[PDB]
Amino acid sequence: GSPRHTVPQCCYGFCIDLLIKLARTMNFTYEVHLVADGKFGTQERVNNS
Amino acid sequence: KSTLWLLVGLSVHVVAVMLYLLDRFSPLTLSSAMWFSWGVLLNSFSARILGMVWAGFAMIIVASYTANLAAFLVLDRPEERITGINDPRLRNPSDKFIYATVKQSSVDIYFRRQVELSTMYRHMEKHNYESAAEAIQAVRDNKLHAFIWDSAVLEFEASQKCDLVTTGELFFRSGFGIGMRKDSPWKQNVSLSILKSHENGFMEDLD
Amino acid sequence: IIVASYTANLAAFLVLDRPEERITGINDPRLRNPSDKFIYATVKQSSVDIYFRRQVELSTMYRHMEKHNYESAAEAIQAVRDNKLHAFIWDSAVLEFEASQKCDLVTTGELFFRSGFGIGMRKDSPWKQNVSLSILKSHENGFMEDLDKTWVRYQETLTFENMAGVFMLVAGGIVAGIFLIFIEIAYK
Amino acid sequence: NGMIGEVVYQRAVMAVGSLTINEERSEVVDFSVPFVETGISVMVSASVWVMMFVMLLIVSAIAVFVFEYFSFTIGKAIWLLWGLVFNNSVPVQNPKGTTSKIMVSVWAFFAVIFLASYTANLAAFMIQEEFVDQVTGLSDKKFQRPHDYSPPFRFGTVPAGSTERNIRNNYPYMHQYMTRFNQRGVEDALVSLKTGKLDAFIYDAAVLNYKAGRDEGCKLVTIGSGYIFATTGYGIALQKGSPWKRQIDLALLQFVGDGEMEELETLWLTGICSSQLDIDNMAGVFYMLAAAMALSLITFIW
Amino acid sequence: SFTIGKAIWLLWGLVFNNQNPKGTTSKIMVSVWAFFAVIF
Amino acid sequence: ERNIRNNYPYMHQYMTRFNQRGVEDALVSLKTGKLDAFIYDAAVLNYKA
Amino acid sequence: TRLKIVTIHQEPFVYVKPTMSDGTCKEEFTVNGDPVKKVICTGPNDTSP
Amino acid sequence: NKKEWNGMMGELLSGQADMIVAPLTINNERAQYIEFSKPFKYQGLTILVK
Numbered sequence: 001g002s003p004r005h006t007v008p009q010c011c012y013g014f015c016i017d018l019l020i021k022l023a024r025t026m027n028f029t030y031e032v033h034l035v036a037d038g039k040f041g042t043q044e045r046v047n048n049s
Numbered sequence: 050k051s052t053l054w055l056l057v058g059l060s061v062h063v064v065a066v067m068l069y070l071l072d073r074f075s076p077l078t079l080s081s082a083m084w085f086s087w088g089v090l091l092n093s094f095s096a097r098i099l100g101m102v103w104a105g106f107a108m109i110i111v112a113s114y115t116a117n118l119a120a121f122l123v124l125d126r127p128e129e130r131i132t133g134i135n136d137p138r139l140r141n142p143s144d145k146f147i148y149a150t151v152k153q154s155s156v157d158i159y160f161r162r163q164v165e166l167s168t169m170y171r172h173m174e175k176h177n178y179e180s181a182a183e184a185i186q187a188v189r190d191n192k193l194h195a196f197i198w199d200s201a202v203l204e205f206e207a208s209q210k211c212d213l214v215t216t217g218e219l220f221f222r223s224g225f226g227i228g229m230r231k232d233s234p235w236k237q238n239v240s241l242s243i244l245k246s247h248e249n250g251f252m253e254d255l256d
Numbered sequence: 257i258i259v260a261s262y263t264a265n266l267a268a269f270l271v272l273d274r275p276e277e278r279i280t281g282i283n284d285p286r287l288r289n290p291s292d293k294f295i296y297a298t299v300k301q302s303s304v305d306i307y308f309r310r311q312v313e314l315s316t317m318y319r320h321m322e323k324h325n326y327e328s329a330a331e332a333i334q335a336v337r338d339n340k341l342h343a344f345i346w347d348s349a350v351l352e353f354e355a356s357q358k359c360d361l362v363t364t365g366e367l368f369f370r371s372g373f374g375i376g377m378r379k380d381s382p383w384k385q386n387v388s389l390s391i392l393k394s395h396e397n398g399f400m401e402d403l404d405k406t407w408v409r410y411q412e413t414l415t416f417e418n419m420a421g422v423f424m425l426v427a428g429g430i431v432a433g434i435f436l437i438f439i440e441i442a443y444k
Numbered sequence: 445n446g447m448i449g450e451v452v453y454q455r456a457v458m459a460v461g462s463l464t465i466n467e468e469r470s471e472v473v474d475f476s477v478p479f480v481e482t483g484i485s486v487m488v489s490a491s492v493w494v495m496m497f498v499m500l501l502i503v504s505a506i507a508v509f510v511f512e513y514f515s516f517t518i519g520k521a522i523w524l525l526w527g528l529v530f531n532n533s534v535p536v537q538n539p540k541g542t543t544s545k546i547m548v549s550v551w552a553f554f555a556v557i558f559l560a561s562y563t564a565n566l567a568a569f570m571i572q573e574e575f576v577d578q579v580t581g582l583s584d585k586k587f588q589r590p591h592d593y594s595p596p597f598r599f600g601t602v603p604a605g606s607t608e609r610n611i612r613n614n615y616p617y618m619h620q621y622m623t624r625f626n627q628r629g630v631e632d633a634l635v636s637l638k639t640g641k642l643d644a645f646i647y648d649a650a651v652l653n654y655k656a657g658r659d660e661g662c663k664l665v666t667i668g669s670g671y672i673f674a675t676t677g678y679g680i681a682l683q684k685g686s687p688w689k690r691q692i693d694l695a696l697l698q699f700v701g702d703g704e705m706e707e708l709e710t711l712w713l714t715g716i717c718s719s720q721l722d723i724d725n726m727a728g729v730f731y732m733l734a735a736a737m738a739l740s741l742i743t744f745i746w
Numbered sequence: 747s748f749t750i751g752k753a754i755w756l757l758w759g760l761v762f763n764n765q766n767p768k769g770t771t772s773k774i775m776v777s778v779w780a781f782f783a784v785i786f
Numbered sequence: 787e788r789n790i791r792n793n794y795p796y797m798h799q800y801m802t803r804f805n806q807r808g809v810e811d812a813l814v815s816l817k818t819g820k821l822d823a824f825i826y827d828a829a830v831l832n833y834k835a
Numbered sequence: 836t837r838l839k840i841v842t843i844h845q846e847p848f849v850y851v852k853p854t855m856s857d858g859t860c861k862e863e864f865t866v867n868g869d870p871v872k873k874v875i876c877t878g879p880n881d882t883s884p
Numbered sequence: 885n886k887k888e889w890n891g892m893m894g895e896l897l898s899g900q901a902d903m904i905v906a907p908l909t910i911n912n913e914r915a916q917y918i919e920f921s922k923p924f925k926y927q928g929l930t931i932l933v934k
């Protein structure tokens with residue numbers, strides 16, 4: 001779909017409010033970003049070595 | 050998520066004529082006997098015997114038709130739903146029920162460890178979808194038939210779209226938490242804050 | 257609309273509804289934990305008792321059926337006939353033939369412990385092979401089928417429930433109606 | 445040939461793969477105890493009228509009594525009475541006597557609850573879904589001549605099986621009919637049954653039970669549950685005088701003896717699983733109206 | 747005779763099968779309406 | 787009780803008049819009608835139902 | 836050449852009927868003209884109590 | 885202080901009989917001590933109700 005077009009956009013919802021509650025509770029700043037794929041991540045052999 | 054009525058019409062068009070013939074045998078008379086038969090067949094002295102016979106048969110015919118229309122509409126509804134994971138049309142599937150899951154999901158690994166799910170695994174490896182909205186739009190346009198996913202996400206999708214309906218089974222009752230690193234100082238107070246949200250209605254506020 | 261609702265709730269009253277008089281098999285939890293009413297039993301000193309004794313989680317049934325172990329199966333039939341019993345674990349075709357004898361005797365839906373009846377034998381003996389050969393020769397032809405026809409296979413609108421009382425009430429109201437007409441005779 | 449050639453010629457020990465049991469297999473080798481119920485199978489694709497008549501005579505007698513108290517409805521109340529069983533709105537007669545009006549009210553209340561009970565009885569008849577049975581079993585007249593019935597149908601078995609030996613010992617003429625009715629592929633025979641290239645099929649019981657339990661649409665029809673069939677089982681064949689036979693039979697009855705065999709039966713088997721006509725009673729309607737016109741032809745001669 | 751606008755009473759009464767209409771149009775229309783009442 | 791005391795101390799005061807001891811005794815109290823509702827762990831009540 | 840055959844009174848399988856006069860069996864028929872092939876058996880009338 | 889057999893099996897082990905011809909239940913415990921032929925009947929278990 002999009003091989004190279006990366007922008008900052010507005011993310012919100014349930015777990016975003018959870019992260020805002022945790023940053024409101026615990027003393028830390030935070031960086032929010034997406035993942036480079038559309039996948040969780042599974043244990044798989046890479047096709048070299 | 051009848052022809053038998055035409056037979057009844059031919060029979061009563063014989064019955065009214067033979068009733069007027071029996072009236073002619075041992076006596077606007079023709080139209081009077083016709084309109085009397087019009088009163089008889091729709092429920093609006095020897096001929097009166099065949100009249101009361103045909104009245105009894107007319108009531109038993111319309112009672113049987115009420116019975117079998119109720120039969121055709123009551124019992125013919127609930128055979129449409131899917132019986133979940135134990136469906137033999139999913140345990141032993143075919144090219145008809147199209148069911149799938151998200152590509153590289155842990156649900157696929159959960160099905161892969163269970164060695165009695167290899168048939169569904171080889172079914173669903175043909176339709177591994179990238180995102181959930183792919184599966185939503187594909188089942189929305191009748192290009193799918195079922196989808197394997199967690200509960201509350203599909204509950205929210207059923208709340209948004211009324212045509213999307215989940216199933217009745219609730220298996221592998223698991224939990225979602227917060228993914229973490231290894232041994233790290235950000236471990237204890239995070240779970241403490243989550244449980245502090247559990248003890249009050251802040252989880253209910255998020256609901 | 258009231259008499260149509262009466263037709264509707266009598267259809268709700270006698271057509272679809274059915275109380276669970278049966279057990280629907282061994283996996284009924286009401287017999288897994290018994291009481292004074294739900295009485296299950298078996299024949300005293302049978303292999304069903306040993307098979308349930310090997311069952312490590314059904315020790316409740318093994319310790320409960322000792323109150324109701326019976327010598328012969330006819331004792332069990334007469335006990336469940338006289339409402340002393342409420343369940344009886346037994347082999348299938350025997351109770352099927354007894355259902356062919358007595359109509360009230362009804363089996364259950366589930367079918368478990370699919371075992372076999374054969375011929376009891378001694379140890380190493382010169383009558384071991386030919387008995388099994390003759391039994392298998394009986395199985396290959398219709399001799400087993402003829403023995404089934406003699407014993408195994410051979411077995412043996414209404415409106416009388418809530419309208420027979422209506423029949424008695426209508427037949428009784430005629431006399432009271434004629435009595436009210438005698439009251440009208442006393443007037444006239 | 446096959447597994448019997450492997451065991452009898454001592455190239456193996458036993459066969460865990462399934463095998464039927466007949467006399468010559470008992471001659472060449474020795475079987476174990478049976479562990480599963482597997483025979484053979486064939487797959488294909490009163491006084492109410494009397495008491496109401498008595499009550500009709502009671503109503504006619506009370507109408508005669510009304511005529512005696514307080515001039516054409518003496519015995520002519522039969523047409524009014526059995527015209528008002530059914531609520532036909534037919535102009536019959538309006539009785540001046542209060543006794544006849546109360547009696548017709550009781551009669552009509554009884555008729556309303558009678559037709560309500562008849563609708564309930566038809567719903568109870570709707571509960572019982574009928575299942576027609578073309579072949580009763582192995583002793584069918586269809587197993588004498590297929591052209592004795594008007595379509596000459598067709599059925600067979602798998603090649604080189606012991607069921608063919610059972611046929612050749614039981615019915616050599618039906619083996620000669622099956623010579624034109626042979627087949628090769630089991631799923632090919634399933635496609636022949638679905639599309640219509642085959643009528644019936646004889647095989648073992650539980651294999652067809654498992655193939656029908658996952659048959660989509662559930663259109664395949666069995667015959668009973670193994671009633672008029674060979675009534676046999678599956679076992680493991682061992683050599684004549686094998687040292688393992690006693691321990692194998694004890695282990696098989698142990699696996700029966702704990703539900704573990706029943707657990708594997710539950711695991712490996714899934715035994716799951718109509719229009720607007722009542723033409724039997726409609727043919728009864730035609731027969732009763734023929735009887736009624738016969739009675740009218742009787743009453744014509746007076 | 748007086749069933750000009752008074753046919754509402756007997757019309758809705760023949761819905762439930764509880765004056766004899768002399769008109770042929772009346773008989774055919776009441777028969778269609780009563781057949782619809784039976785299936786209703 | 788601790789969750790109620792962190793949520794509703796007033797309803798804890800109402801429950802001070804509404805206490806009980808036996809779990810199956812409160813079950814029998816629900817059977818007879820001596821109690822309107824009962825707050826308890828969910829799966830145990832599912833097994834009891 | 837003579838085998839002692841023990842049995843138990845099984846209600847569909849083993850029928851124990853008293854003799855007619857002295858050690859004899861009334862050879863009755865079935866519905867298909869087959870005489871019921873009875874046999875002489877020896878046993879007690881009741882149990883030990 | 886011994887587990888011993890009774891009934892038809894106990895009288896067969898004593899030699900009072902020669903061959904049990906009866907609807908004999910086949911299981912593990914009996915097969916440890918005596919021998920079985922191939923069975924004539926195959927059936928499971930069921931519950932008798934009224």
Ligand SMILES: *[C@@H]1O[C@H](CO)[C@@H](O[C@@H]2O[C@H](CO)[C@@H](O)[C@H](O)[C@H]2NC(C)=O)[C@H](O)[C@H]1NC(C)=O
Nearest residue numbers: 025026027233234235236237238239240241242
């Ligand atoms: C966050 O985690 C730290 C772990 O260092 C914890 O700090 C403890 O705080 C309590 C009082 O709130 C003290 O009794 C402990 O001695 C502290 N431990 C240490 C050494 O830090 C506590 O769980 C959280 N609070 C913060 C911000 O320190």
Ligand SMILES: *[C@@H]1O[C@H](CO)[C@@H](O[C@@H]2O[C@H](CO)[C@@H](O)[C@H](O)[C@H]2NC(C)=O)[C@H](O)[C@H]1NC(C)=O
Nearest residue numbers: 380381382383384385386387388389390393471
């Ligand atoms: C079992 O029966 C067989 C017959 O089926 C008996 O074997 C026969 O013994 C006679 C002795 O003269 C021979 O003439 C026959 O040729 C034998 N038949 C066979 C099958 O070879 C046998 O004696 C019986 N005993 C057992 C248990 O083997």
Ligand SMILES: *[C@@H]1O[C@H](CO)[C@@H](O)[C@H](O)[C@H]1NC(C)=O
Nearest residue numbers: 001002003004005006007009
């Ligand atoms: C969407 O992705 C395409 C392909 O990389 C990109 O050209 C486009 O600019 C993106 N849309 C937005 C958010 O501008």
Ligand SMILES: *[C@@H]1O[C@H](CO)[C@@H](O)[C@H](O)[C@H]1NC(C)=O
Nearest residue numbers: 022023024025026027028029
């Ligand atoms: C976080 O910690 C810093 C000191 O390390 C402090 O200045 C700041 O106010 C804290 N923020 C809060 C209030 O959590």
Ligand SMILES: *[C@@H]1O[C@H](CO)[C@@H](O)[C@H](O)[C@H]1NC(C)=O
Nearest residue numbers: 042043044045046047048049
């Ligand atoms: C698998 O092999 C292909 C080349 O055929 C390669 O392009 C790809 O990156 C490999 N996948 C993984 C897991 O790295």
Ligand SMILES: *[C@@H]1O[C@H](CO)[C@@H](O)[C@H](O)[C@H]1NC(C)=O
Nearest residue numbers: 853878879880881882883884
């Ligand atoms: C059996 O016979 C004995 C004779 O000693 C008798 O006392 C007993 O009543 C009999 N039982 C019956 C009638 O079966």
